[PDB]
Design a protein around this ligand. Structure first.
Ligand SMILES: [Mn+2]
Ligand SMILES: [Mn+2]
Ligand SMILES: [Mn+2]
Ligand SMILES: [Mn+2]
Lengths: 308, 211, 317
């Protein structure tokens, strides 16, 4: 079918300036050639770089730098809504995980019955006060859960976000690093998740089979795959800002992506938290980037055996 | 200066058969297989014969090739107007560690009958005359077939120096023709009371004069 | 049982050679000691022809090495036929995967009802028309299939090979890289295979259970295990040819070999593409070689939970 590629160079203050180059890195790993080869019609929308520009670092991270995000997400959600209405499936390259706000928002505007699959070592379900203003990359999903609204504060630049999805409509895979409140939220609001323990407990195959029985069990729905790169074991994914050990095997992540493709309902995908500066060497960078390309490609049909 | 020895030139009558030989040694034809390539007047040669005696589909049975010891042979029966071209014999050399070819054999299948070269030569130009660069031009045209030996008779003697002459090639009417230029200093043209262009084909001579 | 060890140092020209040291590396990793310890009769037939890769130039690539290879396989098939008739199980150290031609051929001459299990990232099943000029390392299966014969060309040195096995009698495990025609061939001729996806989706255990239900489901038959070293994840098997990532775990390949042993019907084994020149370091080389030794040993009984080596009782002080 058709695929829209959206660069979203987001960043947390000072610590991980590099991650915005992620999109360019995944591109430079031949993302376009590979999706082209699968037979997908490819409209690349370039990068929607920081509209007010990367503002010089002084105060800002606690004041204007998060707003610049809130609005950037608004722009993204608009592009996504436009791309999704035009009939395209939406690939969003990151960039830090905040861009999930915009993408799931913009997606929900034409696909209001959408469900989410969250492949990430973290749940990134913190609130704007609980996990500070460092960044919302661990703090997005809240803005999108309708059950969490009574416990989230209206922030400057996030006035536009309306809760897209129920708690019983997002499923997590890969959870291995988690703040206490996130655990509470997930147990409290009855949100379904499979961590590495559950992976080891039941095995990747059963995880995807249960995941699909939960989300799209009784009615076909369009699926939003948000894939965080740290979800893969740091040996595989060494160029991510905050990497957690005891993560997914290469084969497991391809198996997820493959399974997602076979449902046929994939409507949009996010590939994020790939900061290449974090790599010690050129090879570390390219190997992570190349892994990304694979994940996207596997989700859009590429199988291990060559059917070209 | 190639590797294999072919005969430089063959000619025969339309409807007849011709054989082109290829002479080599143990290192080339001795132990390895030979191939035949037809290069036309211009453009990229094509595979005619491969593995001594094999023709590609579309190459007619009028052609064939043979080989024994340190020599191979290309046979063409029912010789036709289109066949005239440069023919190359190609094989593999184990001692030279290189794919090698013959010098090449030019064919002139006699399509028409003989034609005389009516030579027309021009002297130093008035401009050139005062410009201290006299270039004697003796152009040859409308002759058949094959290259014509060209020479410059100078002051009751021969002259070979500062002289260029083109290859024979046919025009729209299939008349093969070439051109020769003699470069002299004005003095070279002054003292010498006589000059002539001496042109020779298969048969006879036709030379003009300039003083 | 009894086990025959055959060195076969095959190659596909310069830039791809070095695999010839393959058998020697496995040997130097204590292959003999370990198979000895399992309590199996060991006749080692040394290395095979090892034609010193002629003048390493010329048209040797084009005809001399391929002609010599085709015939080298003929010699191998003879040694295998001889070893197999004398009652031995046949271990063949490689060398490039092309030695599979000779081994499955020579095996088939006394065991015509044999079946194949092909553990390799690749299917190694092109036609010679599909060759990449650096030729035969990855299209050996074709000559052996008795349904792809009408579409494969009589080559120089390969006049002797007659199609040994049906398409329904080879099963592949480990598929990760496949050229388009090979995929076509496998779908077209209805050849059974289990890739990494099938491994992940079913588990290694079920793969072997299906594989045995296919091959030896209704009739006990001798099994030919052709094991390509690239089949294992490149982290495990870094000294191979065209290695592909997402390969089998160490424990999965032991599990295969172990399962194969338990059937009891292992008749011959190939261990191939073990190029040590490919390794950056001594450790990379030895680790791959050592992995090989394990695979062979696991196939012939080595159990990890302790050897089958008899102990009547323990000592007295
Ligand atoms: Mn993460
Ligand atoms: Mn995340
Ligand atoms: Mn192989
Ligand atoms: Mn292989």
């Amino acid at each position: 079918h058709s695929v829209a590629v959206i660069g979203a160079p987001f960043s947390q203050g000072q610590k991980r300036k590099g991650v915005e180059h992620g999109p360019a890195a995944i591109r430079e790993a031949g993302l376009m050639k590979r999706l082209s080869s699968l037979g997908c019609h490819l409209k690349d929308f370039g990068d929607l770089s920081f509209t007010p520009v990367p503002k010089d670092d002084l105060y800002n991270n606690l004041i204007v730098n998060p707003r610049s995000v809130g609005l950037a997400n608004q722009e993204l959600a608009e592009v996504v809504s436009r791309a999704v209405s035009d009939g395209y499936s939406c690939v969003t390259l990151g960039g830090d995980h905040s861009l999930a706000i915009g993408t799931i928002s913009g997606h929900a505007r034409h696909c209001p019955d959408l469900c989410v699959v969250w492949v990430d070592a973290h749940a990134d379900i913190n609130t704007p006060l609980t996990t500070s203003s460092g960044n919302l990359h661990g703090q997005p999903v809240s803005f999108l859960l309708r059950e969490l609204q009574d416990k989230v504060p209206q922030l400057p630049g996030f006035s536009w976000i309306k809760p897209c999805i129920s708690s019983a409509s997002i499923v997590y895979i890969g959870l291995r690093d988690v703040d206490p409140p996130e655990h509470f939220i997930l147990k409290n609001y009855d949100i379904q998740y499979f961590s590495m323990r559950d992976i080891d407990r039941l095995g990747i195959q059963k995880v995807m089979e249960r995941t699909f029985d939960l989300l799209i069990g009784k009615r076909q729905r369009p699926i939003h795959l948000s894939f965080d790169i740290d979800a893969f074991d740091p040996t595989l994914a060494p160029a991510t800002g905050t990497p957690v050990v005891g993560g997914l095997t290469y084969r497991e992540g391809m198996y997820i992506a493959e399974e997602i493709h076979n449902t046929g309902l994939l409507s949009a995908l996010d590939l994020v938290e790939v900061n290449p500066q974090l790599a010690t060497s050129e090879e570390e960078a390219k190997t992570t980037a190349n892994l990304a390309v694979d994940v996207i490609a596997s989700s859009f049909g590429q199988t291990r055996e060559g059917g070209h | 200066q190639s590797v294999l020895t072919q005969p430089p030139s063959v000619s025969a009558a339309p409807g007849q058969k011709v054989t082109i030989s290829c002479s080599g040694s143990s290192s080339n034809i001795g132990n390895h297989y030979v191939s035949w390539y037809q290069q036309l007047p211009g453009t990229a040669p094509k595979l005619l014969i491969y593995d001594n005696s094999e023709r590609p589909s579309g190459i007619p049975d009028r052609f064939s090739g043979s080989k024994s010891g340190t020599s191979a042979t290309l046979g063409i029966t029912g010789l036709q107007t289109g066949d005239e071209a440069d023919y190359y014999c190609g094989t593999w050399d184990s001692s030279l560690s290189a794919l090698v070819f013959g010098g090449g054999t030019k064919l002139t299948v006699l399509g028409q009958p003989k034609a005389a070269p009516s030579v027309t030569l021009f002297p130093p130009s008035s401009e050139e005359l005062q410009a201290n660069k006299a270039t004697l031009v003796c152009l040859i045209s409308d002759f058949y077939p094959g290259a014509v030996t060209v020479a410059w008779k100078a002051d009751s003697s021969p002259v070979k120096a500062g002289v260029e002459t083109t290859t024979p090639s046919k025009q729209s009417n299939n008349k093969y023709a070439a051109s020769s230029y003699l470069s002299l200093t004005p003095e070279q043209w002054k003292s010498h009371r006589s000059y002539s262009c001496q042109v020779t084909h298969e048969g006879s001579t036709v030379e003009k004069t300039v003083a």
